Every structure is written in C-alpha cells, then in structure tokens.
Design a protein around this ligand. Structure first.
Ligand code: GDP
Ligand code: ALF
Ligand code: K
Ligand code: MG
Lengths: 766, 51
C-alpha cells in the first residue's frame, strides 16, 4: 500500500515476456550482441561486393597504383579536417590549389573550361563567386558532381540536367553570405569526374575588389582578403595568379596579395586570362613580353605563365572553349610574335603543370601534419587527462546517456519516497498556507461573539464555502509543487561536495518539459471536497490525545501571530526606555504618538477587557482628546491602525491563557465536574482542520504515488527521448569543456587515421 | 483489430490482479465470508427472520 506504481510495471512487464519472450530474447539481446559483431564481419562482405564493382569503374583493381578514387582519398582527409577545424589554426596547414586574381579577370575560367563551365553559374553582370568553392577533379567518365557532398544522378552532357545543377551551387553560394557583406568564407564542396580532369583540388576563392561600390555591402573587400588568407598564410597552398588581361598589370590587386604570401614565387604560378582583349584594343605585345618574364609581377611566380582565352560567350561548351583556345593561341601575334609558344600557353598544359606541382607539395608536407596532429593529441590528452583524471575516454553521446539513466534513476528514487514524508510535508506545507486565512477570516471574527453556537455555526458555513472553492485547489497546488520540490532535490541537488554540474542544463531542461506535461488529475479536487466536508462535518472529539495534540499546535499558530503582531508593534512604537538608554536610541514622533495612543487603548482594555475589536468613533474621539489633553494630536487613522495590532496582542494573550487553562484546568481531575466558561471551541476548530488536512495529504499522497509520479516518470522518458534525438540541445546542454575536449581528441584521432590513410596511399609507389 | 488483439490480453492480467487484491483485502477484513452474494445475504436474513 506504500507504493503501487512499481508493482504494476513489473506485473505487465513479466506478462509481455510470458507471451513474447520467444521473440524478444532473440531481438533484444542475442541480435544486439551479434549485431555489432556482424557489422565488422558480415557487412564487410556486402560492402566488398559493391566496392569491387565500383573499383572496376575506377579501374583501381585492374591497374596497380592507378585509381580515380585514389584522388578521392585526398579530399576525404580535408573534409574531416574542415569539419574538425575550419579555422585558420588548421586550414592554414592544408595543401590546396587556389584561383587568385582580380574579380573582373574572370579568374575562375581556369577551372570552367575543365569541368565547371557546365555546372557552375558564370557570365558577366555580377560577382558570381560568393564563397570558396572547391572542386575535386579526377580522371574518369562523365559523372554528375557531388553538390555539398550530396549524391546526384544527372547527365552532364544535357542542358536540362546541367541547369538544375547550376541552380544547386548558386543556392549554396548565396546562402553562405550573411547580412553586411556579399562574400562568405563558408566553403562549397564539389567532386566531379570526367575526361580531361586532373587529380587535384582547385578552389575558386571569391574575387578581390579594389573598392566596395554602392552595389556591394561595405565589408566585401575586407572579407575577401580574410578569405584570401587560405593561401596567404598557407605554405602548402599553390596559387594561380590571374592578371585581368583587359587592364595593365599596374592596375592589379593580385600582385600584393600573393607577393606578401611568397615573394619568390615558389608557392605560385602566374596565369593570365582574357589575353584576346589585347587585340580588341590596340595590342602591345612588348608588355606581354614583360608579362611572360614577370617584370611587372612582384610575386615572381614560378613555372610557365599560361594564358586562358575564350570567345566571351557564357554558353560556350567546354569542348568549344578548348578548340577556340588552341586556334587562337597558335595564330595570335600576342603569343606568336613573343616568346609564348602555344603548347605551353594552352590551359591543358597549366592543368597538367598544376597537377604536377600539386602532388609535389602534397607528398612533401603531408607527413608533417601526421606528426603535428599526433603531438597535438598528446598535449591535449596530457592536459585533458590531468584536469579530468576520471574520464580517460569521453564522448558527448556517453555523457548524455549517463545523464539519461541517472535522471531516470533519480525520478524512480523519488518514487521511493515513503508516504510518511509525503503526508507530513503536504500537511505541514498546506496548513501553513491556510493557517492565517482561518485565523484571520474565520476564527477571529467568530471569536467576537460569546455565543459558542454562533461561533461554531459561523465558521462551519465559511469553511464549507471556503472548502468548496479554495481548499482542494490549494491542496493540489501544494502537492504539485511538493513533488517538484523533492524532484528538483533528487534531480540536481549535489551529493555534498561531489556533483556533475555538466548534467544540470539537461536536468532542468528535462524538468521544464516534464512539469509542463505534468497535468495533475483534474478530479482530485472533487474527492477532497467530499473528504473535507466529512472531516469538518464530524466534530466529535471523544479522545483526550486528540485534544492534547490539537491545543499545542493551535498555540504555536497563535504564538506565531502574537510575535508577528508584537514585532510590528515594536516598530510602530519603537524601542522602550530599556533600549533607548541602552543603545542611545529615541522614538520618532509617530512612535511617540503610538506609545501614548497604545497606552490609552491599553487603559481602555485594562477595564473593558471584553471590549469588542470594533471601535466606536466616540472611543476614537475620546482617545484623541485624552492625547490632545497631553499635547498629542492624533489622526483617527493612526488610532485605528494602532488599535488593530494592540487588540490582537490583547486577544491572543487571552486566547493562550484560555488554552493554558483548557489543558491545565481539564487536566486537574477534580475540575472536570466544574462547568466553568472554558468551552475550548477553538481547539475543536483547529483539531478538525488538522485532521482534515491530514486526510487531504493522504489523498494527495495516494494520488501522488499512484498516478502523478508515474506521469512524471513517463514525461521524463518522453522528454529524454526527445533530447536523445535533439542533437542541438544535447550539444547546447553538454558544454562542459571536457566533453568538447574529448570530442576534439576523437576528431584528432580520426584525422590521424585519415592523414595516415592518404599518406599510406602515397607510399603505394614503392 | 490491430489494437484489440494487442491490448486485450493486458486486461486479463489487470482484472486477475484486481480480483486477487480485492479478495485478499476482502477476505482478510471478512474472513467468515469466503464467497458471498447479495442473493445469499437476503435469503439468510429471510430464514433468520422467520426463525
Ligand atoms: N574573352 C574571354 N572571356 C572569358 C575567358 N574566360 C571566361 N570568360 C568569360 O567570362 C564569363 C564567366 O567566366 P568566369 O570564369 O565565371 O569569370 P567570373 O564569372 O567573372 O568569375 C563567361 O561569359 C566567359 O565567356 C577568357 O579566357 N577570355
Ligand atoms: F567575377 Al568573380 F569570382 F572572378 F565573381
Ligand atoms: K566578372
Ligand atoms: Mg566566378
């Protein structure tokens, strides 16, 4: 009878097994223990069956050391790195090839005529590049590129598919840009296969703008510079410097961006675009001869200075661009009358030369990263472990689940609270809430008559009306709060000096959802009304012990009121001579008035001890004249306020003296046959309420332990499952700086594997 | 029929548990009457009154 919710769950839980254990045992334990093992061993078979078919498309199985997915290893390493750390602290050490040049140059053309002319939005009229776009190029058949690493199935040779693919990239480009600028560092990941593509990662960084026009947000050019740090602070970056062939080199921006990155040109190759505009204006090949020699290019870029040319139409196909480029370069005086042989100028030579320089840098510098990340992990683990010796290995998934079980365990522990605590806490809390209402609004005005029948009649009518409207509504609220008060203590209270504060955000977050769903039984009040009516209706106290308990607790309530009034009075009247002379204090003129106003009222009560609480205006006038006769002029309102506090002090002392004789007078045996005027009807009123609330608490406790705590437990389970799926809150709640460090350690460990996997793939040559 | 077959078996356990809890308390408070009915109660009075 102490608790019934736990028994119900066990009974039906066994029933479920009795009917379905022959299916549950296989699914719940046998399958799950084998499930993890088969992931390593049997999924291996299905992965290999498809992988081999995919490798045949790659040709990796057919040809040793030659596989189109071999270059995809390089991108996988960077994809983890960008997710692990997209900031300069990690990005600055990641090898890459970047397209750098004046925005007007159309610098991206170096990549458009390879694969991107079909799927990347282009054309003049507006700035196209909005954020770094990385394209993973690989020798292979035509295949729809990955867009934001998402799979696609499109034909790259038909306009209808390509147009939709151009839309997809544009959406990422603009969405990466936030208010205040037109460019964003947030990168876009593309991976395309097709003929003529080289194994390398080329990034089209947003074009630099000398000045921010009114058509662009003010921070455009500063943002591009910060994005330009992808190479300016990256010793592993290869820079393709694009000179806008429409304008002279002395008008360029790229010269300063790269010359401050590598003034020796060791990390860069200079490329020129739109050279054919030289013949749409008065061509000056003598300036081109300086261009090839790098006289006017401070970065002294190394390699052959390739040139890109195009019809300028934004619909020219990749094949059309290649054919146009070859014919123009092989005949134009810009290159035929200067030392720029077309077979070195052609973009396809740049792609090969860029691919050649790409693998040179990657193999040389990649091994340094493996040592760097390993050193990082050891330094992080040493400090992380020393500050958190308890957690040698931690994850945010492990952190959440521990709380999930811990929370459910505590709420169950809350369900283990004995009724003794519930009944005492509910009874004590509820009575204290309504202890003054009865005294001030029911008892004291009823005490103004000497007719005990009216006294009991008056209160009973008020109580029944009060009972119907207030008592069960306050009682449930106390019970609802009382359960939450213990729940919070069970939930988030520390175990002395040991406490995992890392879990407090989730615990309180779970509570708020669980209390919102904690709807107390809407009919609990109806039972209490019947109970309270019966508890009040039965006023028969035939037991001395019932009398003894009721009177002592009534005294405490009255003594509390007496001190409450007395403390208010002392402030109203101030210190007496004992404290005025002891602490060198004095009275305010109001306190002086109150003391004399008090004295006159005390004298009035000294004789008229039975004076009713209500004062006649003649008494108010009498006091005023009695005080005015001593030089004290008092507003009637002061007297009435003084009167109320002093009267209760007078009354309450009388009531306690009545209580003293009620217990003592009846206690003496020979006095029980003396019918004195000591009808302790207040003890009858107090006793019934004490019993009435005690029964109320028991009804609340029964509902508390039978229905409400189970609803609280059920809601917690519903909320915790929502949190289990709510990754963002789990991240937002689990921010303890050790799980985040543990998360970083995991990512560092993964990168070390990914770094070595690619490095291991480099070592396939020997 | 999906809901009825799934949940109906729970009722059988619930009612059986109800009877055992009711019989335990009912029998303990009324050990004399292991089985009682309002028809048996009336007839006993009928004979008792006539006697
Ligand atoms: N004349 C000429 N036009 C080009 C060349 N490369 C690209 N374009 C034109 O520039 C426009 C878009 O090229 P794109 O590489 O996207 O430059 P961006 O949009 O300014 O970054 C298209 O209309 C192309 O025809 C080139 O080498 N010569
Ligand atoms: F014109 Al650009 F990136 F070269 F938008
Ligand atoms: K442009
Ligand atoms: Mg562009």
């Amino acid at each position: 009878a102490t608790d019934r919710g736990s028994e119900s769950d066990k009974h039906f839980r066994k029933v479920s097994d009795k009917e379905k254990i022959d299916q549950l045992q296989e699914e719940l334990l046998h399958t799950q223990l084998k499930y993890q093992r088969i992931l390593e061993r049997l999924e291996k078979e299905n992965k290999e069956l498809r992988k081999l078919v995919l490798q045949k498309d790659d040709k990796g199985i057919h040809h040793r050391k030659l596989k189109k997915s071999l270059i995809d290893m390089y991108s996988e390493v960077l994809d983890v790195l960008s997710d692990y750390d997209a900031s300069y602290n990690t990005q600055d050490h990641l090898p890459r090839v970047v397209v750098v040049g004046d925005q007007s140059a159309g610098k991206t053309s170096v990549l458009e005529m390879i694969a991107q002319a079909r799927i990347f939005p282009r054309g003049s009229g507006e700035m196209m590049t909005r954020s770094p776009v990385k394209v993973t190029l690989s020798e292979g058949p035509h295949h729809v590129a990955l867009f934001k690493d998402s799979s696609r199935e499109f034909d790259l040779t038909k306009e209808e598919d390509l147009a939709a693919l151009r839309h997809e990239i544009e959406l990422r480009m603009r969405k990466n840009v936030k208010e205040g600028c037109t460019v964003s560092p947030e990168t876009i990941s593309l991976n395309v296969k097709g003929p003529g593509l080289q194994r390398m990662v080329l990034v089209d960084l947003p074009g630099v703008i000398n000045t921010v026009t009114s058509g662009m947000a003010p921070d455009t050019k500063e943002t591009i510079f910060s994005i330009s740090k992808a190479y300016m602070q990256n010793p592993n970056a290869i820079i393709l410097c694009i000179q806008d062939g429409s304008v002279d080199a002395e008008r360029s921006i790229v010269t300063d961006l790269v010359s401050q990155m590598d003034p020796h040109g060791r990390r860069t190759i200079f490329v020129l675009t739109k050279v054919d505009l030289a013949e749409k204006n008065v061509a000056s090949p003598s300036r081109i001869q300086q261009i090839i020699e790098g006289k006017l290019f401070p970065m002294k870029a190394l390699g052959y200075f390739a040139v890109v040319t195009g019809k300028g139409n934004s619909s020219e196909s990749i094949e059309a661009i290649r054919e146009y480029e070859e014919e123009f370069f092989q005949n134009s005086k810009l290159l035929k009358t200067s030392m720029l042989k077309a077979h070195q100028v052609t973009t396809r030579n740049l792609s090969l030369a860029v691919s050649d320089c790409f693998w040179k840098m990657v193999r040389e510098s990649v091994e340094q990263q493996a040592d760097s990340f390993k050193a990082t992990r050891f330094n992080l683990e040493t400090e992380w472990k020393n500050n958190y010796p308890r957690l040698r290995e931690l994850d945010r998934n492990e952190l959440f689940e521990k709380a999930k079980n811990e929370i459910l365990d505590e709420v169950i522990s809350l369900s283990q609270v004995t009724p003794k605590h519930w009944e005492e806490i509910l009874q004590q809390s509820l009575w204290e809430r309504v202890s003054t209402h009865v005294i001030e609004n029911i008892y004291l005005p009823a005490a103004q008559t000497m007719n005990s029948g009216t006294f009991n009649t008056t209160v009973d009518i008020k109580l029944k009306q009060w009972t119907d409207k207030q008592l069960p509504n306050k009682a449930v609220e106390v019970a609802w709060e009382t359960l939450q008060e213990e729940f919070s203590r069970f939930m988030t209270e520390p175990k002395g000096k040991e406490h995992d504060d890392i879990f407090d955000k989730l615990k309180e977050a779970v509570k708020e959802e669980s209390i919102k769903r904690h709807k107390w039984n809407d009919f609990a009040e109806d039972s209490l009304r019947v109970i309270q009516h019966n508890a009040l209706e039965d006023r028969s106290i035939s037991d001395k012990q019932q009398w003894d308990a009721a009177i002592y607790f009534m005294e405490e309530a009255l003594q509390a009121r007496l001190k409450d009034t007395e403390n208010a009075i002392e402030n109203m009247v101030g210190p007496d001579w004992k404290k005025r002379w002891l602490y060198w204090k004095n009275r305010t003129q109001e306190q002086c008035v109150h003391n004399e106003t008090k004295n006159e009222l005390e004298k009035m009560l000294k004789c008229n001890e039975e004076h009713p609480a209500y004062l006649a205006s003649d008494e108010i006038t009498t006091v005023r004249k009695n005080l005015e006769s001593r030089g004290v002029e008092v507003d009637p309102s002061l007297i009435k306020d003084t009167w109320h506090q002093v009267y209760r002090r007078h009354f309450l002392k009388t009531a306690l003296n009545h209580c003293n004789l009620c217990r003592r007078g009846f206690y003496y045996y020979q006095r029980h046959f003396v019918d004195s005027e000591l009808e302790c009807n207040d003890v009858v009123l107090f006793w019934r309420i004490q019993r009435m609330l005690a029964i109320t608490a028991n009804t609340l406790r029964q509902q508390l332990t039978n229905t409400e705590v189970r609803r609280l437990e059920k809601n917690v389970k519903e909320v915790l499952e929502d949190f289990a799926e709510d990754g963002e809150k789990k991240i937002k709640l689990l921010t303890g700086k050790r799980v985040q460090l543990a998360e970083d350690l995991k990512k560092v460990r993964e990168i070390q594997e990914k770094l070595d996997a690619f490095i291991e793939a480099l070592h396939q040559e020997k």
